[PDB]
Design an enzyme around this catalytic site. Structure first.
Site, PDB file in Angstrom:
ATOM      1  N   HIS A 195       5.548 -10.316 -35.095  1.00 35.63           N
ATOM      2  CA  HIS A 195       6.812 -10.769 -34.768  1.00 35.63           C
ATOM      3  C   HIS A 195       7.178 -12.159 -35.408  1.00 35.63           C
ATOM      4  CE1 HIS A 195      10.456 -11.852 -32.399  1.00 35.63           C
ATOM      5  NE2 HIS A 195      10.896 -10.850 -32.396  1.00 35.63           N
ATOM      6  N   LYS A 224      14.571 -19.544 -31.794  1.00 37.32           N
ATOM      7  CA  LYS A 224      13.553 -19.547 -30.620  1.00 37.32           C
ATOM      8  C   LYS A 224      12.931 -21.047 -30.501  1.00 37.32           C
ATOM      9  CE  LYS A 224      13.018 -14.868 -31.542  1.00 37.32           C
ATOM     10  NZ  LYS A 224      14.012 -14.521 -31.174  1.00 37.32           N
ATOM     11  N   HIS A 260      19.448 -16.258 -32.739  1.00 32.89           N
ATOM     12  CA  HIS A 260      17.992 -15.677 -33.048  1.00 32.89           C
ATOM     13  C   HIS A 260      16.946 -16.878 -32.856  1.00 32.89           C
ATOM     14  CE1 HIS A 260      15.019 -13.305 -35.664  1.00 32.89           C
ATOM     15  NE2 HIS A 260      15.350 -12.637 -34.539  1.00 32.89           N
ATOM     16  N   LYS A 291       7.787 -14.566 -38.604  1.00 33.31           N
ATOM     17  CA  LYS A 291       8.297 -14.567 -39.705  1.00 33.31           C
ATOM     18  C   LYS A 291       7.850 -15.757 -40.609  1.00 33.31           C
ATOM     19  CE  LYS A 291      11.777 -12.985 -37.183  1.00 33.31           C
ATOM     20  NZ  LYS A 291      11.151 -12.129 -36.029  1.00 33.31           N
TER      21      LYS A 291
END
Ligand SMILES: O=C(O)CCCC(=O)Nc1ccc(C(=O)O)c(C(=O)O)c1
EC number: 3.1.4.-
Length: 438
Positions: free
Chosen positions: A327, A104, A102, A329
């Protein structure tokens, strides 16, 4: 500003809400550095689109794609990249079931130094178009002179911590990037790295990752204040995992307990969770298709209806982004009147045990399924006791932190429901005139 926290550009908002924002073409611009090699860590890639985001003069420089795809998904990604001889791939091992790569992150090696970008967006057009996404931009890190012996380490230990995160992959392409990082001076870094990697961690290693890593940093580098029990915890995310049959199973027992840690000494703390309602999605810039990137399933949600009484609407007037679905968090610790924060985290980690870790073996082992990465802003790392909340995100001391959404968060109304992406919505059309029929 000392924080170097940015939002992505949103198509359709007035220019004042994009003046301080970054598009991917801005990040990769020659103005940020003369590129010689890059690594793109992510989940989803559109390779044709991605190469077009690099400046034309940089499009043949080596690119490493770090992904978690297996089997047919892996074959599809290889097929996307095969037209570009300069693109290599690194498949991150996912040896625990139901894990995801996950993280990025961009590693950008320049003639002039090195930059690290930790962010929240997939490498596809839709993620940079009309969503609220977060970016942390490192300083330009200079190269350490050949023959000079210095650590290049920051007071937050970011250099060693980033190398430790990359070492967990056990990948030759990433050992090359470890060697690059070793040769650079990262001492100016003022954020703490918080990563997750897959595994089962005991004793010496339990504090390395996930919510125990967060707990350790808050114990060591934050102080508890009077009436700390009154300072809420806020979590804000784009997806939710299976958290158990009630709040005592994980959410309020180990997750919240880590997030409410302050200082070294041995709960009524309010917990706000921010997650888009159906109405938030319907009226968004993208309409119902925004919900394709909010992947809360009905199978998961129907097992934990207790959770939704914690949910608050997405609202972001401060940054002009109420209709740009999140999107990003984020997690943070505001004061009771939301005027200050004790810390702020931007991360890839959603509200899930896979991302944050779950205790196993009588509380002696932390099990993590996924790769995640974020950065933690602590007042002590800036010579401060707390951060003042910036009143308007793009407005004008610089020691105020740019929180990208509105405070206090607004509880769902009685008719609101959490966005659930695999059931139909056919009662009211979205901003493009359409319904949602999965
Ligand atoms: O938590 C769990 O146990 C599984 C829940 C399913 C899920 O949430 N999948 C997901 C995959 C990729 C991304 C992304 O990289 O964008 C995102 C996101 O960030 O929304 C979410």
């Amino acid at each position: 500003n000392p924080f170097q926290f940015y939002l992505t550009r949103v198509s359709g908002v007035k220019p004042k809400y994009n003046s301080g924002a970054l598009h991917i073409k801005d990040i990769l611009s020659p103005l940020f550095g003369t590129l010689v090699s890059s690594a793109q860590f992510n989940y989803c890639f559109d390779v044709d689109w991605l190469v077009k985001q690099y400046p034309p003069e940089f499009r043949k420089k080596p690119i490493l794609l770090v992904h978690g795809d297996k089997r047919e998904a892996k074959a599809h990604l290889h097929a996307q990249a095969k037209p570009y001889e300069n693109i290599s791939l690194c498949q991150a091992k996912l040896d625990i079931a139901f894990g995801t790569h996950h993280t990025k992150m961009m590693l950008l090696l320049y003639e002039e130094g090195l930059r690290v970008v930790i962010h929240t967006s997939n490498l596809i057009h839709a993620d940079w178009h009309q969503k609220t996404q977060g970016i942390w931009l490192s300083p330009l890190y200079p190269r350490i002179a050949d023959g000079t012996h210095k650590s290049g380490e920051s007071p937050t230990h970011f250099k060693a911590d980033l190398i430790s995160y990359l070492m967990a992959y056990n990948a030759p392409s990433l050992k090359e990037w470890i060697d690059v990082i070793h040769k650079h001076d990262l001492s100016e870094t003022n954020v703490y790295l918080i990563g997750s990697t897959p595994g089962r961690f005991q004793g010496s290693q339990k504090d390395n990752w996930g919510h125990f890593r967060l707990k350790k940093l808050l114990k060591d580098h934050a102080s508890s204040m009077p009436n700390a029990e009154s300072w809420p915890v806020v979590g804000q995310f784009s997806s939710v995992g299976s958290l158990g049959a009630d709040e005592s199973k994980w959410l309020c027992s180990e997750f919240k307990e880590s997030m409410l840690t302050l200082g070294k000494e041995s709960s009524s703390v309010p917990l706000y969770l921010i997650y888009p309602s159906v109405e938030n999605v319907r009226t968004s810039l993208e309409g119902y298709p925004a919900g394709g990137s909010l992947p809360y399933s009905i199978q998961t949600a129907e097992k934990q209806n207790w959770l939704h009484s914690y949910f608050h609407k997405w609202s972001a007037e401060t940054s002009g982004r109420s209709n740009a679905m999140p999107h990003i968090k984020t997690y943070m610790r505001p004061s009771p009147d939301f005027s200050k924060i004790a810390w702020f985290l931007v991360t890839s980690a959603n509200l899930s045990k896979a991302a944050w870790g779950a205790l196993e073996k009588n509380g002696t082992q932390l099990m993590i399924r996924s790769y995640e990465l974020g950065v933690l802003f602590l007042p002590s790392a800036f010579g401060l006791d707390s951060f003042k909340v910036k009143q308007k995100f793009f407005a004008g001391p610089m020691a105020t932190f740019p929180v990208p959404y509105d405070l206090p968060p607004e509880l769902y109304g009685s008719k609101d429901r959490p966005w659930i992406w695999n059931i139909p919505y056919v009662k009211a059309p979205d901003t493009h005139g359409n319904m949602w029929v999965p």
